[PDB]
Structure 1
Amino acid sequence: MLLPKRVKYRRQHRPKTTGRSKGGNYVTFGEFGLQATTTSWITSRQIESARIAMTRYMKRGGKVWIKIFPHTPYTKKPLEVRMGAGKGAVEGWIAVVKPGRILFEVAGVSEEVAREALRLASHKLPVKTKFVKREE
């Protein structure tokens, strides 16, 4: 649950989802990057239900480096009521990804682990992924 602390406004607009990526199209903190190939809203809960799990495969082995942080906090109403008497209280945090962006970064550990670990991790996210080998 990667969330912030101090926010000026608590109710915001749904982010725009069209077009290619902007920044973070490469990998730094480790040899190996997991790219993204479609568009969606990753929603902090995926991240910590696809981080603890990747480390439970990693058995507290090597180290990871996350390349996605949810900023715009999405809101939602509780029980199904009438339409329109205000906005629902914030209940989530979302991050938007576009095709061509490295989401995770790791170092040192063997490529067998890299493949058989990011395949474990992608099985939680609603975006379709593809391996990247730091292919200079």
Structure 2
Amino acid sequence: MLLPKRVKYRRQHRPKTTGRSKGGNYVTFGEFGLQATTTSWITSRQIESARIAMTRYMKRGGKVWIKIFPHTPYTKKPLEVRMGAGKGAVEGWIAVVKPGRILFEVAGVSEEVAREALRLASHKLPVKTKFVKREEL
């Protein structure tokens, strides 16, 4: 249920997935976060699942930031049909994550509660992950 309000173009090219992440490689908002170690597309039902799982374990405790937003539409053909009579209708929205990138951050909670929340969130996501803290030094 994250999706933009308007786009300029409903059909877009699909993102490149090679490389390391351009920005957002640091926890800047909370105390802890969840970092990605491989590359995937993340589809905003995965975001909604991983946010719901993480919230109810915290029992409305601390706060949670989502550092990932799905801007890009993706299309698919609805039934399996002949090849190519134009592009299909838009199906969902993706963000693209590459290794380095923080996916979620939490604050206002103890460390082991945060570890358990981020582990429960990470079992919903299609990417490998790593619990991290604020950098210092």
Same fold per TM (> 0.5)?
yes
Name the CA distance, whole Å, in 2 between partners of 1:92 and 1:132. 29
Name the CA distance, whole Å, in 2 between partners of 1:133 and 1:85. 50
Instruction: Kindly provide the CA deviation profile for residues 89-126 of structure 1, in whole angstroms up to 9, marking residues without a partner as x.
Output: 00100000111111111112000101111010000101
Secondary structure in 2 matching 1:135: coil
Name the CA distance, whole Å, in 2 between partners of 1:10 and 1:133. 38
Name the CA distance, whole Å, in 2 between partners of 1:93 and 1:34. 21
Q: TM-score, normalised by structure 1?
A: 0.97
Structure 2 runs not aligned, ≥5 long? none
Q: Is the 8 A contact 2:33 2:118 kept in 1?
A: no
Secondary structure in 2 matching 1:54: helix
| Equivalent residue, structure 2, for 1:75 | 75
Q: Is the 8 A contact 2:72 2:94 kept in 1?
A: yes
Comparing 99-108 with 37-46, greater Cα deviation is found at 99-108
Shift of the alpha carbon at 1:72?
1.1
Shift of the alpha carbon at 1:53?
1.4
How many residues align? The count is 136
Instruction: Kindly provide the CA deviation profile for residues 41-79 of structure 1, in whole angstroms up to 9, marking residues without a partner as x.
Output: 000000001111111111222110100000111111101
Name the CA distance, whole Å, in 2 between partners of 1:21 and 1:53. 25
Shift of the alpha carbon at 1:7?
1.1
Q: Is the 8 A contact 2:62 2:106 kept in 1?
A: yes
| Equivalent residue, structure 1, for 2:2 | 2
Shift of the alpha carbon at 1:135?
3.2
Secondary structure in 2 matching 1:90: strand
Identity among equivalent positions (%) equals: 100
Q: Which runs of 4+ in 1 moved over 4 A?
A: none
Name the CA distance, whole Å, in 1 between partners of 2:99 and 2:60. 30
Comparing 50-59 with 114-123, greater Cα deviation is found at 50-59
